Short mmCIF file of N, CA, C and O in Angstrom, two decimals:
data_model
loop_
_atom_site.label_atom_id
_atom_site.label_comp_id
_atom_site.label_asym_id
_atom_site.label_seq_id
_atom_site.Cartn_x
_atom_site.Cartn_y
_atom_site.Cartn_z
N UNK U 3 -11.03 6.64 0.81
CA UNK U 3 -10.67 6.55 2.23
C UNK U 3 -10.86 7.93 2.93
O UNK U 3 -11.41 8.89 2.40
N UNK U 4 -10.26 7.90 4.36
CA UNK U 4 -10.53 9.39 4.95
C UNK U 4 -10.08 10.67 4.04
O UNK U 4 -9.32 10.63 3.07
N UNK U 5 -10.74 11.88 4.62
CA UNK U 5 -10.69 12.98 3.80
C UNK U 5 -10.76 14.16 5.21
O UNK U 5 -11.45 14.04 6.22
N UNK U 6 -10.11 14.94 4.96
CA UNK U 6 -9.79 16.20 6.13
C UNK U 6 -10.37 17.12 5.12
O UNK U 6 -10.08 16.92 3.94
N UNK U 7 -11.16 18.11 5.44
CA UNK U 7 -11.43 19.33 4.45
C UNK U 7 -11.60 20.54 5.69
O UNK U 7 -12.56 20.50 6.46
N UNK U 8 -10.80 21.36 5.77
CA UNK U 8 -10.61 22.17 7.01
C UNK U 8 -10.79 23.62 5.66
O UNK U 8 -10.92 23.58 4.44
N UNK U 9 -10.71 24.80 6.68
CA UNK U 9 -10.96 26.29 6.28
C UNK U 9 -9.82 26.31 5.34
O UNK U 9 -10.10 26.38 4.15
N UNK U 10 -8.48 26.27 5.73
CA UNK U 10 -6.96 26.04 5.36
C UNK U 10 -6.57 25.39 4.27
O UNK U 10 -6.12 25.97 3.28
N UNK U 11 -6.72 24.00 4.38
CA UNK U 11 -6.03 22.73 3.87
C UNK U 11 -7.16 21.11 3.68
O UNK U 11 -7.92 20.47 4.40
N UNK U 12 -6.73 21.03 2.45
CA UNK U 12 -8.16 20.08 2.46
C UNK U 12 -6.79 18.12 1.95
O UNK U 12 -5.72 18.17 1.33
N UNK U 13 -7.25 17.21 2.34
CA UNK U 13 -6.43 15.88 2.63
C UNK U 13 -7.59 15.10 1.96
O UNK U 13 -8.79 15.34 1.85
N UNK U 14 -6.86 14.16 1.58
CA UNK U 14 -7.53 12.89 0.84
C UNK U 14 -6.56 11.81 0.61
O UNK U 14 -5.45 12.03 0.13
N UNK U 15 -6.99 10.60 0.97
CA UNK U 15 -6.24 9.53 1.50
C UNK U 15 -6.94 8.28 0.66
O UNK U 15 -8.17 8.32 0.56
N UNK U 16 -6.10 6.98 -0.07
CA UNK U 16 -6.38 6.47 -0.95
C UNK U 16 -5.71 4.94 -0.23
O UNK U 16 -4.51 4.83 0.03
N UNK U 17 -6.51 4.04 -0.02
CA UNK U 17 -5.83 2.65 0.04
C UNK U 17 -5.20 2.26 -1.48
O UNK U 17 -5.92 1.99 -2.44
N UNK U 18 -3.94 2.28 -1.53
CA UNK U 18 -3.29 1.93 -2.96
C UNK U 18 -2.09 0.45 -2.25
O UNK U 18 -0.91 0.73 -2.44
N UNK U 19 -2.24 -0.46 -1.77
CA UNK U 19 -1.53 -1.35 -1.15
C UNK U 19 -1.16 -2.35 -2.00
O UNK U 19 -0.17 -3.02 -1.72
N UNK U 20 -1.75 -2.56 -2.93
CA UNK U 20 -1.74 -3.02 -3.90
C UNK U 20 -1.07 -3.11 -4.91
O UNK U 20 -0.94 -4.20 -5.47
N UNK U 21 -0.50 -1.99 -5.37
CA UNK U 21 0.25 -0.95 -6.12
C UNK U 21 1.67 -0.49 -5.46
O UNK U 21 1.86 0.01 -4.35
N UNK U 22 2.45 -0.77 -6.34
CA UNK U 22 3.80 -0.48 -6.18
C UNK U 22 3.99 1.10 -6.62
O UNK U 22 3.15 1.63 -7.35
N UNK U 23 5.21 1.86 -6.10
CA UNK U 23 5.13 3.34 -6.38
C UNK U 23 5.05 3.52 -7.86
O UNK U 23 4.11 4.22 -8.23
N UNK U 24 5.90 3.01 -8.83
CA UNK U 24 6.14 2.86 -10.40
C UNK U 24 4.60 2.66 -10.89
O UNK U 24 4.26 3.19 -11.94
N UNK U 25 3.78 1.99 -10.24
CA UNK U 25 2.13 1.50 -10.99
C UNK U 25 1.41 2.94 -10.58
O UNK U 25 0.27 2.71 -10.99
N UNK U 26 1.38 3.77 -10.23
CA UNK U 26 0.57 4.87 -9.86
C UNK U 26 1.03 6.24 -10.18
O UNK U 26 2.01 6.73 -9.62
N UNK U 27 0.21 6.98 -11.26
CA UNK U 27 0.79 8.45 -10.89
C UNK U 27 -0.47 9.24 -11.02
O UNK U 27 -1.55 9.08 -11.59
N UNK U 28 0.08 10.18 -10.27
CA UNK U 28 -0.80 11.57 -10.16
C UNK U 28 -0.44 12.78 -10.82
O UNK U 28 0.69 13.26 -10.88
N UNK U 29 -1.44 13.22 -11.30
CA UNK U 29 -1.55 14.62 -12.10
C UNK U 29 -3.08 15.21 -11.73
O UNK U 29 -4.17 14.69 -11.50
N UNK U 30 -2.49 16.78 -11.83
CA UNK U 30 -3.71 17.49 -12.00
C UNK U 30 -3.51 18.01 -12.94
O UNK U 30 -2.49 18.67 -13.12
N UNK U 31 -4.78 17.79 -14.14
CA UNK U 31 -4.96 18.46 -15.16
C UNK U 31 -6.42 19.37 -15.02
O UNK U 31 -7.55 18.92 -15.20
N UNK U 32 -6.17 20.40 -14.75
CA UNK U 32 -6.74 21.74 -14.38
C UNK U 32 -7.48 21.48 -13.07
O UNK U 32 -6.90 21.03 -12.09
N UNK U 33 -8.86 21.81 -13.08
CA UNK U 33 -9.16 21.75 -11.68
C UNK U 33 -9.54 20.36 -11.17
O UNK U 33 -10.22 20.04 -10.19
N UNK U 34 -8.88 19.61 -12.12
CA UNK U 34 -9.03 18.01 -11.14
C UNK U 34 -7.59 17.31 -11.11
O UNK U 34 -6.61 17.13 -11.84
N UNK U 35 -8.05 17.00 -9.82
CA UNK U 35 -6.68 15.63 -9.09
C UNK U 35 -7.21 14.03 -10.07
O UNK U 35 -8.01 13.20 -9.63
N UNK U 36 -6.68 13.97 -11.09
CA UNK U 36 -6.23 12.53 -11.16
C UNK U 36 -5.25 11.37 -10.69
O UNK U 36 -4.03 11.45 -10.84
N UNK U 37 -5.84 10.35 -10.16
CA UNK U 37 -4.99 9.12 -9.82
C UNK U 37 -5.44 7.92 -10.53
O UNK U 37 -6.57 7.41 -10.54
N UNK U 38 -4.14 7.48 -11.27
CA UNK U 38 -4.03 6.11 -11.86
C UNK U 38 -3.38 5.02 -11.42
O UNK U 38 -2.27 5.12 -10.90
N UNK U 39 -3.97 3.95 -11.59
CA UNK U 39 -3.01 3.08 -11.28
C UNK U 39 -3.39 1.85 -11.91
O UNK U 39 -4.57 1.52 -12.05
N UNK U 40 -2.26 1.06 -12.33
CA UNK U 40 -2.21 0.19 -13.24
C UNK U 40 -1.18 -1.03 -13.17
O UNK U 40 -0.01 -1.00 -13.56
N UNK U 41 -1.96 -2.28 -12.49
CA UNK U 41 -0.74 -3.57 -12.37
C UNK U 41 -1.18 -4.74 -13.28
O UNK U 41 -2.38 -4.99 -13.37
N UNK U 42 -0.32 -5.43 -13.91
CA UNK U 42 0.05 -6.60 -14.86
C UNK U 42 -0.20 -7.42 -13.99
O UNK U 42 -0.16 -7.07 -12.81
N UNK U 43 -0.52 -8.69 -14.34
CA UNK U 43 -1.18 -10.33 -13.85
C UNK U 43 -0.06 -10.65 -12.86
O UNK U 43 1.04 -10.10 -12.82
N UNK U 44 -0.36 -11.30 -12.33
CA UNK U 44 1.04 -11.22 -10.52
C UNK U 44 0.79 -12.08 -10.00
O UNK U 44 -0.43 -12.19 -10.12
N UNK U 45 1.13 -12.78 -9.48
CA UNK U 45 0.79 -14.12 -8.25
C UNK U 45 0.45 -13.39 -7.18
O UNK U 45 1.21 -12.56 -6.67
N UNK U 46 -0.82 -13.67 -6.73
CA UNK U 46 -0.84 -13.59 -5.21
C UNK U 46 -1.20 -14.64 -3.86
O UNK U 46 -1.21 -15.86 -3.98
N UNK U 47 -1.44 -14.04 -2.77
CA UNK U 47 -2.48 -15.51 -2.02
C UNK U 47 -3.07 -16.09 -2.50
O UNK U 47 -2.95 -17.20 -1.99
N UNK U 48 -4.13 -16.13 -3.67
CA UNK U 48 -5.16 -17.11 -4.05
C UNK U 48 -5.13 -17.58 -5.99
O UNK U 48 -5.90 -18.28 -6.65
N UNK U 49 -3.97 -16.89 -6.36
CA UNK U 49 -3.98 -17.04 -8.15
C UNK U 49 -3.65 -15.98 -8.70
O UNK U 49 -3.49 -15.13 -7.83
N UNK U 50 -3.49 -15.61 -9.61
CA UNK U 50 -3.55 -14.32 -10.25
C UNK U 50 -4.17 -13.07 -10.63
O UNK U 50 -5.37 -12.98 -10.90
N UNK U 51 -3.62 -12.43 -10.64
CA UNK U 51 -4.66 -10.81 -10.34
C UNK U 51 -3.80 -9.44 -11.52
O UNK U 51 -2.65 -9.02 -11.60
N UNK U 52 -4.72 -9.23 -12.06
CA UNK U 52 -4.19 -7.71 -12.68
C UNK U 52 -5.26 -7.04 -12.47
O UNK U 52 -6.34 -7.58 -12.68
N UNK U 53 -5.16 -5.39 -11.89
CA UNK U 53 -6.00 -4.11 -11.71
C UNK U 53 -5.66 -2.76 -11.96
O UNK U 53 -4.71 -2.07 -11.58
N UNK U 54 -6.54 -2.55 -12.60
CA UNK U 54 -6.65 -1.12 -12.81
C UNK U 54 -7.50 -0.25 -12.73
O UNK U 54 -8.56 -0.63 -13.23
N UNK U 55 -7.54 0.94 -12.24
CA UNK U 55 -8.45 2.42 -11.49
C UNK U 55 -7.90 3.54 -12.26
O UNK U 55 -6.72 3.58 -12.61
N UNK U 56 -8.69 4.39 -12.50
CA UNK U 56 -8.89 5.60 -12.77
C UNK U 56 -10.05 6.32 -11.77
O UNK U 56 -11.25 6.15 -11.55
N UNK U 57 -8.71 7.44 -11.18
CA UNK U 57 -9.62 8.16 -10.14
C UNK U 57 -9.71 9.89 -10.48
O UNK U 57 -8.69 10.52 -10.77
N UNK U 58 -10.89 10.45 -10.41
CA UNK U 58 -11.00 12.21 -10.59
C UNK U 58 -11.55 12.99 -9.30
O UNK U 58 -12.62 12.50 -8.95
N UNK U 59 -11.22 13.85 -8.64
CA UNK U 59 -11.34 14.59 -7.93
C UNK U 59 -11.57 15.91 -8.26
O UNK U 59 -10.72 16.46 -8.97
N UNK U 60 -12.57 16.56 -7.89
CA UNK U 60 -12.64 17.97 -8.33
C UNK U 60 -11.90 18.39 -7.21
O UNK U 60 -11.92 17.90 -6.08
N UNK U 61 -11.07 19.57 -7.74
CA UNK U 61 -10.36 20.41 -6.76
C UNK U 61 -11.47 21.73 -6.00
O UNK U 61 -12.06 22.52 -6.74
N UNK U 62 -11.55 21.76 -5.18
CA UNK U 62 -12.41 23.19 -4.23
C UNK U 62 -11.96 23.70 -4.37
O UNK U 62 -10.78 23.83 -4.04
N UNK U 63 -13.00 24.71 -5.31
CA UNK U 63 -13.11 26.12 -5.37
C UNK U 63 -11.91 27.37 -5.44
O UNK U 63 -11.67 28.23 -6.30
N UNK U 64 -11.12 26.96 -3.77
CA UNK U 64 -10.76 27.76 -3.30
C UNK U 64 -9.18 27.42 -3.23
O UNK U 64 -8.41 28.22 -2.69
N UNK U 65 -8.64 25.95 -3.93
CA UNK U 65 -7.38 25.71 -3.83
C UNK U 65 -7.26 25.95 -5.52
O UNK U 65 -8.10 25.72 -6.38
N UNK U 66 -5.55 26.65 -5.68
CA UNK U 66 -4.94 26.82 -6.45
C UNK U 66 -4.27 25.72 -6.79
O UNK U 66 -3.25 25.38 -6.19
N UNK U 67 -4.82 25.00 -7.85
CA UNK U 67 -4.18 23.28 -8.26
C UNK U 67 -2.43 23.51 -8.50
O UNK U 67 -1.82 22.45 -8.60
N UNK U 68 -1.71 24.56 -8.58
CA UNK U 68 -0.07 24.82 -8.82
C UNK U 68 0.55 24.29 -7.18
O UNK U 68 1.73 23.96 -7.05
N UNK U 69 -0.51 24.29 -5.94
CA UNK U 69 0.28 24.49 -4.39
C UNK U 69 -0.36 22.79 -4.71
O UNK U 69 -0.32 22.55 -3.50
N UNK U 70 -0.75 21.84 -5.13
CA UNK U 70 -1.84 20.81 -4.79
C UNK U 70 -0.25 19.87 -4.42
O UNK U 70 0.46 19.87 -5.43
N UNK U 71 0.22 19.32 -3.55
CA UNK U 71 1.10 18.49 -3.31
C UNK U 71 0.48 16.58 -3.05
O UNK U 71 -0.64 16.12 -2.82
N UNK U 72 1.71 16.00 -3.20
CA UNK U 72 1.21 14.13 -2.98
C UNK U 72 2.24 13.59 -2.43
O UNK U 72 3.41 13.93 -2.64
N UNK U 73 1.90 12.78 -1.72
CA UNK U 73 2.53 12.06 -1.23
C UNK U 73 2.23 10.28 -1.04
O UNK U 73 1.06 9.91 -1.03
N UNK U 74 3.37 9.25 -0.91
CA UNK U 74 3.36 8.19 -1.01
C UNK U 74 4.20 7.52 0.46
O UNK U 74 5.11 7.91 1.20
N UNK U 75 3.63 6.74 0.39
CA UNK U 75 3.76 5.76 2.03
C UNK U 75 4.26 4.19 1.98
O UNK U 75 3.80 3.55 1.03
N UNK U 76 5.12 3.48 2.83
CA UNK U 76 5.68 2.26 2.47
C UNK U 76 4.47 1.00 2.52
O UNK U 76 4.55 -0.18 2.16
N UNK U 77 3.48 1.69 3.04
CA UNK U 77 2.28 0.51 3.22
C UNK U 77 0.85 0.69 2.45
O UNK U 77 -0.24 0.12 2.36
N UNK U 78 1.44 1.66 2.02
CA UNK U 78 0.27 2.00 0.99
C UNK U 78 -0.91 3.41 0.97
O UNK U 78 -1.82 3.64 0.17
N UNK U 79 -0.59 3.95 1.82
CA UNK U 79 -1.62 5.26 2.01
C UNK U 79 -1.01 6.20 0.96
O UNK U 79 0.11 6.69 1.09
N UNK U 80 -1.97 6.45 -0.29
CA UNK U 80 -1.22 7.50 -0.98
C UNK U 80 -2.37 8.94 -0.88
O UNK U 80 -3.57 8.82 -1.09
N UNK U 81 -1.61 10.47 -0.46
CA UNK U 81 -2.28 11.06 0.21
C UNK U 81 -2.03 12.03 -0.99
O UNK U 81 -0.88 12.05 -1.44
N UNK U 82 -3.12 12.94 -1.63
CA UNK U 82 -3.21 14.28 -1.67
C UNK U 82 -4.10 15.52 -0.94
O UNK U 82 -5.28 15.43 -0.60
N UNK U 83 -3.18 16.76 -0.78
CA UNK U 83 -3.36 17.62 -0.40
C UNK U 83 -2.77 19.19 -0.69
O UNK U 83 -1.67 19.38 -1.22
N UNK U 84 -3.48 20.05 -0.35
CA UNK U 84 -3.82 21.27 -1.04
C UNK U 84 -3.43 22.26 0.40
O UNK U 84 -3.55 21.73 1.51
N UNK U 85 -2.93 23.82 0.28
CA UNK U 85 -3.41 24.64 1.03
C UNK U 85 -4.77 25.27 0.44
O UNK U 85 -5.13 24.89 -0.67
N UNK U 86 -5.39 26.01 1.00
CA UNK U 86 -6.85 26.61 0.38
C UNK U 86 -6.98 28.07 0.60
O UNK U 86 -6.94 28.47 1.76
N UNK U 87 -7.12 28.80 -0.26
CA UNK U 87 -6.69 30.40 -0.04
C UNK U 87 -7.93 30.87 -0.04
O UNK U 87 -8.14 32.08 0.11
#
């Protein structure tokens, strides 16, 4: 989804709507942002559904992955972002 990459601070934005907060976590293991997420067979509108993603992001250059912060949303936008030194 959208992505902000400014001089400063760089944003990255993930449709995860799907996914309950408990089915998803994030880690950075060194200079990459990983996001997982992982749901069991479920009823939905049309039958049953289980999914799972594995996501990698290289971190830029210029951000220190220790400041890399995340955040989570009631409708589903799960956002990471960085200051950039």
């Amino acid at each position: 989804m959208e992505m902000r990459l400014e001089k400063d601070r760089f944003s990255v934005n993930l449709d995860v709507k799907h996914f309950s907060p408990e089915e998803l976590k994030v880690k950075v293991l060194g200079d990459v942002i990983e996001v997982h997420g992982k749901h069991e067979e479920r009823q939905d509108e049309h039958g049953f559904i289980s999914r799972e993603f594995h996501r990698k992001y290289r971190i830029p250059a210029d951000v220190d992955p220790l400041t890399i912060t995340s955040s989570l949303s009631s409708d589903g936008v799960l956002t990471v972002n960085g200051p950039r030194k």
